[PDB]
Design a protein around this ligand. Structure first.
Ligand code: HEM
Ligand code: HEM
Ligand SMILES: Nc1ccc2ccc(CNCCCc3cccnc3)cc2n1
Ligand SMILES: Nc1ccc2ccc(CNCCCc3cccnc3)cc2n1
Ligand SMILES: C[C@H](O)[C@H](O)[C@H]1CNc2nc(N)[nH]c(=O)c2N1
Ligand SMILES: C[C@H](O)[C@H](O)[C@H]1CNc2nc(N)[nH]c(=O)c2N1
Ligand SMILES: [Zn+2]
Lengths: 411, 407
């Protein structure tokens, strides 16, 4: 079965054969599309075919499919599974798997970078202090004084689900949120629940609008522990506008390194519940979502007042007008401080080229339109006009429940 | 099987039961979502008829009444006898309103119950069709105070007697391809503009030439007609701050009147069913004016604003896009032609969604189409989870007549 996608701006038509190699389900049925739904302990029984599928992929990629090295590896894994109920990936396999997880990430516009990913193998880690050390090294390497480098740090895989390694932070670097008795929120509202946990675990909160949260680290199924990332290692950028001089007086800044820490990485049936990764920001993640979402810093009103827009009717598009200037400021600030960032035009254009290349060399590129299209200026980016097929390949990054909902407290 | 949708900006969760009534297919499977793809007989007829009549009769609180049963029997007899059946006026109106109500891609559906339906099933000729359309256009335009309306021509019979409006909208600007290699007018309408000329239209070869109607009655060859200019309301586009903007020489028409869709009610097919409401600002300012395969005016506007078009990261395109959209809204409002901004309209749709979930058990919605083509996440719809599914009666797409017409 062949599937065609059309760009309605260029008339380019592409043919997907890659979806045929798809296992995991979508949420959709022939009777319903769930494409805008946000989120729609394993026996040796189901483990070997998953191992086999991965290893077959891996050996095809290195042009060794059916080799004695291929076969002996399958054999080796099969035995280790029946002997131990799990298995260990070679370093080469771990690296290949991590990259491909990113490559298969249908919601990620940044995938043109997928082959350049520094893999830090942290599978010898045993303690939270151990995890901290690893994470610090990740942040320093990835930050590279503003010349950002994509990296992932991979802690030991799940075993019985009772000894999980987890990073409790959703991102390695993120700002605290504090609920005030008057109902208002100080700092990042998205992080209120987590901030409370930290406080309850002993964190002494500065209680400001941009307090970098402590790391909360769980090793081997033990209770999590608090560590403060060395400030010298947290690269931040003050936000100013190139023409508006009052913009600095808004008091805004952001951190340079987006480093997602709460996902689960799946490689050949193996589950890596602690696998923080980092790249660099697309400008709109901050300028549109973090700053302008109503449930986030929500700065549109204050910006619009200072610009003196007509705020009495929405039909003045005062919101659209202010949203742009904020995004201009984010981009300007980062570039001025020589910290890696990409605008939504450059990133979407690069994605189209990537996606086209993937169709030619790979027979497809699964992609989630709802997530790929930027949260401002949608149709003036080329992805808006691009038909996309969404399906799930392995290796993959998966969501997992927040650890505080599941963690068995040792006390 | 009972599905919940969450708004992530408000945490509000709605439960969907309505989707269980879904009949048509989506194009999606458990293995692949096609959410972003633009277009994924007697024994066939009576179940369709019955399903429709069941819901019609349920809506007026006479489900399982004799008048219900009797109607079912009447239509059932009529299908057996005639191989088709005719809709009562009451049913035709309910059906059209519900087709709109079920249009999962329409953000304006809060207005769905207020639809003027023009029964044009007695129409036999293209001149006849022309008369009906002029009447429709004039009613709907209402001197700039737009009223929603649909005009319904006779239903399909044997597919060889189809009524068709060849235009995609009742009102649209012509597209001419230049020896210069560029495109004059609306590039989306180039092919249709040729077919007009192929049929004898005398093009003024301008940039904003209102296209002639190309009307097909009873399967016959289509005829050309010029909508009386006095009936075509247009708006010159000026900026409330930039004087030079008027010099760009842009205008647009006030009446969005989609004419190429197929209306299906109780199994019956209405292949000529032009309908109209009013514009959301982004339709003209973002898509019509700023799409690359359209009027594509960004560069020219940006120049006039003197923005740094050197690097993408000055967001000059974004800046212009805003201003262009401000001007469209400003122009329509100043002239008192009905228009809605993307903020007002999406907020309205959230309310409508709430109503539909509360009173009907849900509301099919296509997030990809509902979210406006600019400023997406500063509108409430962006943060709104939606379930897309197909309910009937419905508006469907259908092939362009020239690819089908046995001349
Ligand atoms: C290097 C520059 C990168 C850029 C500019 C980029 C850009 C983005 C953006 C804008 C999103 C949307 C996320 C949101 O809006 O919440 C995203 C999603 C995602 N990215 Fe990338 N990314 C980059 C690198 C990476 C790397 C290194 C990985 C993993 C190794 C990755 C994996 C993912 C995944 C799994 C998602 C989906 C997240 C979710 O479902 O919540 N990306 N990316
Ligand atoms: C009265 C105010 C209305 C507003 C503001 C409105 C708004 C919109 C918008 C923005 C779209 C997206 C289409 C595009 O971007 O090309 C749309 C689609 C659609 N509308 Fe509405 N509309 C209105 C009235 C109506 C009426 C009266 C009908 C039919 C009786 C209707 C039926 C539809 C259908 C079937 C679609 C999807 C068609 C397609 O897939 O191309 N709308 N509407
Ligand atoms: N620049 C980058 C690179 C990679 C990224 C990976 C993930 C994310 C953020 N994911 C958003 C999840 C937020 C959420 C909220 C509620 C329910 N599900 C998810 C950003 C990245 N940015
Ligand atoms: N304001 C309104 C109201 C109703 C509308 C109904 C339809 C449309 C536009 N339809 C766009 C179809 C575009 C297309 C192009 C190529 C292939 N298939 C579809 C606007 C409305 N606006
Ligand atoms: C309901 C909807 O799926 C939700 O708002 C999505 C839409 N698209 C998105 N796209 C990106 N890149 N990031 C997001 O958080 C979201 N949120
Ligand atoms: C590829 C994608 O489906 C296509 O660009 C869609 C996206 N969303 C849209 N949304 C609306 N309202 N109108 C459109 O024409 C489109 N086009
Ligand atoms: Zn789907």
């Amino acid at each position: 079965r062949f599937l065609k996608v059309k760009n309605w701006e260029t008339d380019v038509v592409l043919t997907d054969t890659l979806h045929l190699k798809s296992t995991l389900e979508t949420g959709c049925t022939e009777h319903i599309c769930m494409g805008s739904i946000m989120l729609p302990v394993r026996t040796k029984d189901q483990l070997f075919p998953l191992a086999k599928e991965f290893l077959d992929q891996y050996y095809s990629s290195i042009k060794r499919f059916g080799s004695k090295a291929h076969m002996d590896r399958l054999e080796e894994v099969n035995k280790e599974i029946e002997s131990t109920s799990t298995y260990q990936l070679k370093d080469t396999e771990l690296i290949y798997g991590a990259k491909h997880a990113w490559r298969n990430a249908s919601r990620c516009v940044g995938r043109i970078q997928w082959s350049k990913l520094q893999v830090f193998d942290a599978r010898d880690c045993t303690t939270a202090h151990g995890m901290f050390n690893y994470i610090c090294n990740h942040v320093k390497y990835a930050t590279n004084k503003g010349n950002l480098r994509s990296a992932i740090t991979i802690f030991p895989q799940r075993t019985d689900g009772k000894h999980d390694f987890r990073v409790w932070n959703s991102q390695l670097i993120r700002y605290a949120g504090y609920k005030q008795p008057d109902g208002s929120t100080l700092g990042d509202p998205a992080n209120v629940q987590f901030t409370e946990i930290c406080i309850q675990q002993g964190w002494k909160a500065p209680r400001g609008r941009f307090d970098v949260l402590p790391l909360l680290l769980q090793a081997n199924g033990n209770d999590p522990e608090l560590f403060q990332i060395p400030p010298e290692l947290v690269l931040e950028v003050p936000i100013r506008h190139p023409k508006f001089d009052w913009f600095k007086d808004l008091g805004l800044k952001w951190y340079g390194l987006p480093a997602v820490s709460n996902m689960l990485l799946e490689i050949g049936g193996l589950e890596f519940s602690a696998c923080p990764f980092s790249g660099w920001y697309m400008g709109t993640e901050i300028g549109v979502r973090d700053y302008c979402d109503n449930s986030r810093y929500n700065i549109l009103e204050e910006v619009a007042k200072k610009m003196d827009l007509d705020m009495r009717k929405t039909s003045s598009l005062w919101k659209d007008q202010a949203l742009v200037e904020i995004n201009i400021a984010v981009l300007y600030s980062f570039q001025s401080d020589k910290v890696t960032i990409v605008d939504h035009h450059s990133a979407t254009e690069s994605f189209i080229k990537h996606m086209e290349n993937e169709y030619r060399c790979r027979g497809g590129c699964p992609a989630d339109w709802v997530w790929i299209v930027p949260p401002m200026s949608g149709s003036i980016t080329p992805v808006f006009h691009q038909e996309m097929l969404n399906y799930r390949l392995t290796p993959s990054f998966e969501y997992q429940p927040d650890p505080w909902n599941t963690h068995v407290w040792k006390g």
